[PDB]
Amino acid sequence: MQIFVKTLTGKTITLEVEPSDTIENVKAKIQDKEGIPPDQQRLIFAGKQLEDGRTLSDYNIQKESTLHLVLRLRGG
């Protein structure tokens, strides 16, 4: 199934995924297409940050759902 990801410039990319794909798998597909290391990616969907170890089906992410990719500005 094809989902959408909004990139760090606000452009929409497609990703081919399965409901059983984990968030880590999705981040790896983003790396393959956009080059962003997975350990820096964060994915937002419906106000929730998606968690490693869970699957797309866990969040009811379906064809044509849009995930929002962000990084981090760490501070203390």
């Binding site: 419906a46 940050q49 500005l73």
Partner: protein, 340 residues
């Protein structure tokens, strides 16, 4: 020193991201009031983020000295030797609000957080070479705004809702037509009473193979009209927003420092909250001076903005008094103080 009337939060080194978030949420008065109503009587104080938030808010409301957050830090569980000490403020916001939202389910304050922060958008897709179209409605609790090449918030919203082409390696899967060139656009359906905007001040730099911060100039206004980005406007409730908070990051992707500028009452009287020190400042110091583009100033700029809808301001920023804090919670907190 100019009276502020507000107390700071202790600087434990790595706490600044959470201190800045806590002030932002504390001065979302309608949320603060709901937090005080959460039924934490049976909560384990060493584990409960909701009780720890109540405690911090109670002390921000009552203490004359900088407030500590040790029990929130411990129960939130982010600053540890296995998970980093420095953190992203928008990440913290997403995780903290989800925790509190869950705790309020089934209580007299259920739904407070989505009522304050959740909006709805729609995405449309139309194929160019076959007759095939779709849409999908989705919720959001904040908006990620692109900044690279954009001069200001208005331009970022213009780009957010602008039609884009899905082609090349990003063709749309149009069911039995397979991959198809298509046009895609997003429109806002509603905008919430409290609008959180995350400025995407970062990018991957292939030249150094790493993520970097974008420190470019990017302007944001005190008054923000958003009706033109809605699919359908309401003549009785224009989407006019008023700037409430500027959460400022200094540093790079991998570390730095956070402060927050607020005008808590929405009246244009600003203060800077830098951990334990709260000081009056001018509008320029909170607004223009956080636009970026000074090439520490060169990497200090706004990261997260909070706007409140003008028609909701008197409710969102309603006064909070001791009448709003349940006696059972007051007694629990004083019990803790006396015990030490």
């Amino acid at each position: 020193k100019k009276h502020t009337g507000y107390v700071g939060l202790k600087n434990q080194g790595a706490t600044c991201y959470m201190n800045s978030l806590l002030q932002t949420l504390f001065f979302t008065n309608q949320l603060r009031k709901a937090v005080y109503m959460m039924p934490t009587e049976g909560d384990d104080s060493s584990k409960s983020v909701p009780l720890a938030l109540q405690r911090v808010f109670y002390e921000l409301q009552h203490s004359d000295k900088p407030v500590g957050t040790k029990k929130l830090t411990k129960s939130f569980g982010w600053e540890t030797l296995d998970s980093f000490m420095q953190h992203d403020v928008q990440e913290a916001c997403r995780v903290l609000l989800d925790n509190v939202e869950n705790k309020m389910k089934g209580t007299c304050v259920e739904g407070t957080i989505p009522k304050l922060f959740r909006g709805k958008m729609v995405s449309y897709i139309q194929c160019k070479e076959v007759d095939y179209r779709s849409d999908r409605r989705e919720d959001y609790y904040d908006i990620q705004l692109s900044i690279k090449g954009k001069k200001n918030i208005f331009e970022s919203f213009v780009d957010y809702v602008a039609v884009e082409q899905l082609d090349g390696d990003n063709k749309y899967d149009a069911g039995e037509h397979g991959l198809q060139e298509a046009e895609k656009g997003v429109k806002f359906l509603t905008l919430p009473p409290v609008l959180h905007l995350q400025l995407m001040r970062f990018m991957y730099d292939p030249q150094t193979d790493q993520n970097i911060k974008i420190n470019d100039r990017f302007e944001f206004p005190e008054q923000l009209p958003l009706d033109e980005f809605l699919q359908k406007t309401d003549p009785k409730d224009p989407a006019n927003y008023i700037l409430h908070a500027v959460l400022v990051h200094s540093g790079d992707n991998h570390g730095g420092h956070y402060v927050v500028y607020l005008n808590p009452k929405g009246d244009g009287k600003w203060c800077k909250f830098d951990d334990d020190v709260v000081s009056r400042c001018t509008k320029e110091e909170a607004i223009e001076h956080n636009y970026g583009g000074h090439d520490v100033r060169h990497c200090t700029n706004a990261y997260m903005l909070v706007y409140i809808r003008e028609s909701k301001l008197s409710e969102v920023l309603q006064a909070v008094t001791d009448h709003d804090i349940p006696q059972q919670l007051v007694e629990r907190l004083q019990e803790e103080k006396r015990i030490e």
